[PDB]
Design a protein around this ligand. Structure first.
Ligand SMILES: CC(C)(COP(=O)(O)OP(=O)(O)OC[C@H]1O[C@@H](n2cnc3c(N)ncnc32)[C@H](O)[C@@H]1OP(=O)(O)O)[C@H](O)C(=O)NCCC(=O)NCCS
Ligand SMILES: CC(C)(COP(=O)(O)OP(=O)(O)OC[C@H]1O[C@@H](n2cnc3c(N)ncnc32)[C@H](O)[C@@H]1OP(=O)(O)O)[C@H](O)C(=O)NCCC(=O)NCCS
Ligand SMILES: CC(C)(COP(=O)(O)OP(=O)(O)OC[C@H]1O[C@@H](n2cnc3c(N)ncnc32)[C@H](O)[C@@H]1OP(=O)(O)O)[C@H](O)C(=O)NCCC(=O)NCCS
Ligand SMILES: CC(C)(COP(=O)(O)OP(=O)(O)OC[C@H]1O[C@@H](n2cnc3c(N)ncnc32)[C@H](O)[C@@H]1OP(=O)(O)O)[C@H](O)C(=O)NCCC(=O)NCCS
Lengths: 388, 388, 388, 388
């Protein structure tokens, strides 16, 4: 009934049209998008002989406990409205997951338009994204430790190199697919993209990428990506932004829900404009657990019992043995901590603690196993700066 | 110039008037407030022979790492406007801190109207409070595992007993002063206070305390306190609330910034309406560190170097030795991790990780000390449900 | 499990409390309400030995095709939230309907907070209520044909006598229960009730009852009831209202969705602020049809087939024979027009035409039966000015 | 002083400029508009030797009582602002009416920017247009009886054929001028036009034409035209729309003021966003009355007395004799029902009933004549889906 295939020249325009409709994109903005991602990354689902919908798979990485875990990002999931309510989206997602599994990519992440669909395939809330906003005139920091310099973003390796340093240090950050960088460098003809490095010459310590616009409400500077590796970069960031106060009414940036940059402001003038939880699917239990970093000082063996109604190789008992910041996973054990593959996603990312997952019914464990799992999976609240 | 004293019958009305003005309270609502807290808890500052302002000290406790640490809550800080800009508030706060110190209360917490003032006395951001909101018709949970029963709140020990169980389990929760409970039981003549226990008869598993009102925007049910000790209590909570959908447009509750209750909703329909960071002052470094709980499995000695420009006994080098969930603090060591008493507040509560505090310049450490501190102070993001 | 009873002194306070909670009434406003309606009119449902909820039944009349049909208004339906989601409301409604049936009252009407519940018991959309608003300075009518005179409303028979004239002429209008009049005469201590007769002395042609208030948005005059029996009363109404333009920014009134009063304005300055459809239950098919007025000039026999899963006496085939503005209903016939008791409600009131009910699947008929039903049930769009 | 002429190449640009100014059209959008309608349909008024303004006449039809009555739509009436307040618009309208009369077109319709002007020429409120809106997630219908299929609109006869079926059945619907269809097929470069047929293959039962966009408020799907000939088409319509809930926040459509589609929703979640009354001019009393359909079962002779201060042939006494769904109009009689040509417009369309027109002073009649007129002109509330 539903046939899953790679996109081809024969069907990429139809899919692009379906994507424009699904996401309410202005006429033809789908070409730029599809082109930025690459046709090779798009997948199509057919219903009978007609193109019903599709998505993009972004093979990349994600930083967990400071180790890069291969990760397949799912983007632009759309089913043409005439085919909706018929199981086409879940069929698509299941096929896609099977493909990711065959590629030995152990985890997959996406921003859901609707959670029910993705939970049917084993995705679960697993990390945060948060848009903060603040009035420019409330910043009141003039501590310009480091200079700022406008630089060109496109293919500039300095940005990749600073990014990958903050990424490796931030639990949940992407090892970005080229498309993510593409999106960041993309603006309306309307608008100018501004990019600055923070630091003395040839000693960059961070960067800021932003756009500015005038709206009905007033003027806004939207920071789409930033990096601050040190406190002098943080002071310099805020100073630079505070210095836009005569030209800009409000500034927004993406951070963690418990944002640390606001620690340096004189008052709590910043607010959360919006937030989202992205979801994660544990595609391969063994490989996902073995690829992740673990805290040093932890030596524990956790005996897990996992349910996975889609990918049979993940259904069963596994012993996770952690020592020296690394794990080894073997089959078997006593299954002292039981959960569905969904519970494991939230546990894995440290979004919620074992105790919190127990309380919300996503896992059952003995107190000893609860303690071992708390020690193993403890970490900074997961987030990413990127949307896809 | 400024004289600090306990409030007395001779000056409590003047202070009450100053408090009404400061906090924009309706005429005479200060009497109820002062009465709920008790005159013995109010302090006054004089400028020459005139009452310049004052505050309330709430001696109580706070749960950190599952241990109750004695804590002095600071409430209703007000200086009559004619005495402002003259150092009266900082004088007041310093005197107050000195008194708390003389009582051997090791920490103090408050919600600041302005941060600059309290940071001058060594308070720092240290925990969160967050008001969530959600449309009632988006909850869509009907999983009534446990019944709900309306009960009377006032002096009902069932509430204290369920509260102290969630409190002990929640990093940052208050061991409430009687005034906190008073405030919760207090409503406008306008309004009715609703209180329900969640659970089978004589086996309570949680509770909900709320008010309802109709506004210009529509109807709202404001949850002021809740407890959920188990997943059946959580499902029952949401079911009960979902069942108000024909009568109530929006529901609000207070939780953590990374709220776990929303994990059980079908969609991300809940938003953060507002948030606040409360502040903490480490009044006694040794006693504060020795009173706190620590994670099990950690065995480490952290050599601290603390600056405190107000309370000289906290200025110096301390060795924090942690093992078996407990600490012992001795004087001396190599001061491998240096910080001001403000940095120590944020470190102590686990609001920010050592790495995050390093990056924002609140501490300097060797990588080994950073690791030891990360292991020692790791914990669930601190929050409280209460405002004062 | 659920026991249905008349309210008594033993349970009316508990019910009143439940009603305050359900409808978000200010503390104690339920006493005035319960008192205005009368305890004899309240009904209670018990779950085990506890009061679970209740409602009020308002025995009165409704004008259909110019004949008064006995009608039981259902008001204040509430189930305490702890008993919701357990079938208590539908049990209550079914018991209530059975009681109405035993009293030989053929129809029942209510304003639903949620339609699904009442449709389970055979109520259906059947009439309209609409709140119109207009800027006072856009009326621009100064055609004071008739004078206005302030008069006292309470127990003033002039109002009843003008009301019953417009009522008899308006398809859907209430023959009001005393409680409706009570509600109209009821205001906040805050506010003054204004009542004027329109007409020369001792020759009243209409009236206006209103309140005024100042809000955040500005000033508003809210017309809660009005009567205009002639065009001079209509011109006089608008002139009077236009004359409030220096004191009042906006005026609201309740009318039909296709309001005729706006026909006399110079421009389409009036808008619909809100609308509601009330619902009707055909309690007795024969008696409801025989009590209604029919258009003159119609001579037709309509052979109906009705389903009623609650009240078996309404389930079956009926011949409706109409002539000389009157009907006679007998059992049997060929059931050329089939519908559920819900379809019959909408058909009966003329909210939707047979063709419209066919198209939305509420009835199936032959073209001849469709024509006969169109001729029989044609009429002015049903509405009432009252809410209950 | 004012000379009336057909537009020509010599003056269509000036008029187009005047039209851009009058209607606040973006620079040059008047060319597309003028082109879509055709220069032959535009008329110009001159003041001395200068072009003062103009309009478009749309010769088409309108469905009344299921018969197509020739109708001249008046569009784009504009007088350059320097010529306003001098009688140029009324001169234009009078000339235009005289032309329509000379073409034997018996009725004319328009959407007024200001009523006073058109009433001076005998137009009166006569039908409704209403824009409804609803949150997509409140629809909650998944009853996909019939499939939907995207099809091309432009010159597709399937659309004309389904349209003319709903048109013939809907009292007030247009028999559309080509320009109406043109406008429907016209969108911004910004936007994509979506068109779907509802029904099994080769058995179409309805259709939907819409656009989608993202605004400041959120996302919206605007339905500009739809057809539903049967209940399966109605269920399919709502199902399709409900299936946009993850992508679209709000849906709007045009319907009647007493919309029947909302009868099928679970709750009254839809609201009226805006409404308008269009106006009608009875250009030829005899021909207008003879062209209209009448209800079957009515046999009556109504003796009218009409005033028309513009078109003398309509001023006088007429006998309308109705039988077998048809009329014959002869001159004379006793003028038992008197009205101005404006009253006759509202009577003719069934917007207001005779009783309602009597009450608002638009007609005087004996009770027998009131009854005969009620029987003759009864019908579904008039509306159209189109604006022009
Ligand atoms: C949602 C969309 C994918 C339609 O998919 P579909 O083919 O109707 O979904 P399926 O029929 O496979 O449904 C499978 C499950 O998903 C759920 N689902 C589908 N659409 C949903 C929605 N809008 N809201 C909630 N759940 C939804 C179903 O309830 C079903 O679960 P069930 O078995 O418990 O009923 C569609 O393209 C859309 O409206 N917008 C594009 C935006 C988007 O979906 N983005 C995702 C992030 S890229
Ligand atoms: C703020 C209030 C206490 C006035 O205090 P004050 O006597 O003027 O304060 P002081 O003169 O002691 O000032 C000491 C420090 O506090 C700071 N401060 C005082 N009021 C401040 C304000 N509104 N915003 C920011 N900083 C403020 C000063 O800048 C100063 O720091 P500096 O030495 O760097 O200049 C006053 O009562 C008020 O406006 N409202 C009551 C609300 C409130 O303060 N609540 C606190 C929570 S209970
Ligand atoms: C709705 C209220 C009556 C609770 O009733 P309840 O006992 O939970 O209802 P029941 O368990 O008998 O449910 C029977 C049906 O009603 C429906 N229902 C109940 N509450 C509903 C709601 N808020 N929205 C939609 N449907 C509802 C159920 O879906 C059920 O149909 P189903 O069998 O298809 O599932 C409650 O008092 C309330 O929230 N507010 C008072 C306002 C009010 O209801 N007013 C009505 C006008 S006076
Ligand atoms: C209104 C417009 C046509 C100007 O016309 P004009 O030449 O000033 O009108 P006239 O001088 O012929 O006036 C004749 C009558 O119309 C009335 N009239 C004209 N403009 C009016 C307005 N804006 N509001 C109310 N009445 C108006 C006059 O009061 C007059 O009646 P009176 O004899 O009782 O005083 C002008 O083009 C405009 O502002 N906008 C274009 C929008 C539009 O009119 N659309 C109609 C639908 S296409």
């Amino acid at each position: 009934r539903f046939k899953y295939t790679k996109a081809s020249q024969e069907n990429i325009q139809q899919l692009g049209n379906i994507l424009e409709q699904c996401f309410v994109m202005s006429f033809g903005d789908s070409e730029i998008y599809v082109k930025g991602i690459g046709l090779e990354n798009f997948r199509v689902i057919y219903r009978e002989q007609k193109v019903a919908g599709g998505l993009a798979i972004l093979p990349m990485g994600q930083w967990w406990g400071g180790q890069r875990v291969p990760m397949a990002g799912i983007a632009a999931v759309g089913i043409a409205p005439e085919y909706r309510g018929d199981g086409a989206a879940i069929a698509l997602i299941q096929h896609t997951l099977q493909e990711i599994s065959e590629q030995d990519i152990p985890i997959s992440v996406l921003y859901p338009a609707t959670q029910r669909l993705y939970r049917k395939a084993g995705y679960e809330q697993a990390g945060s994204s948060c848009v903060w906003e603040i009035p420019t005139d409330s910043i009141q920091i003039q501590h310009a430790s480091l200079p700022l310099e406008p630089v060109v973003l496109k293919n500039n390796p300095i940005f990749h190199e600073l990014y990958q340093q903050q990424a490796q240090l931030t639990h949940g950050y992407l090892d970005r697919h080229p498309a993510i960088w593409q999106g960041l460098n993309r603006t309306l003809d309307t608008e100018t993209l501004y990019s600055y490095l923070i630091g003395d010459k040839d000693k960059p310590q961070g960067y800021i990428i932003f756009t500015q616009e005038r709206t009905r409400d007033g003027s806004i500077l939207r920071i789409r990506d930033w990096v601050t590796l040190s406190n002098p970069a943080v002071q310099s960031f805020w100073t630079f932004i505070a210095n836009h106060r005569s030209q800009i009414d409000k500034v927004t940036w993406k951070s963690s829900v418990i944002d640390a940059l606001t620690l340096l402001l004189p008052e709590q003038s910043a607010t959360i404009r919006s937030q989202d939880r992205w979801m994660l699917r544990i595609v391969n239990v063994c490989k996902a657990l073995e690829a992740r970093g673990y805290p040093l000082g932890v030596e524990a063996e956790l005996h897990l019992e996992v349910q996975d109604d889609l990918l049979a190789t993940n259904q069963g008992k596994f012993i996770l043995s952690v020592a020296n910041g690394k794990s080894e996973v073997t089959k078997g054990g006593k299954g002292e901590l039981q959960l569905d593959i969904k519970g494991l996603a939230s546990l894995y990312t440290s979004l919620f603690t074992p105790r919190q997952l127990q309380l919300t019914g996503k896992l059952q464990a003995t107190e000893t196993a609860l303690l071992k799992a708390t020690q193993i999976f403890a970490g900074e609240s997961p987030w990413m700066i990127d949307f896809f």
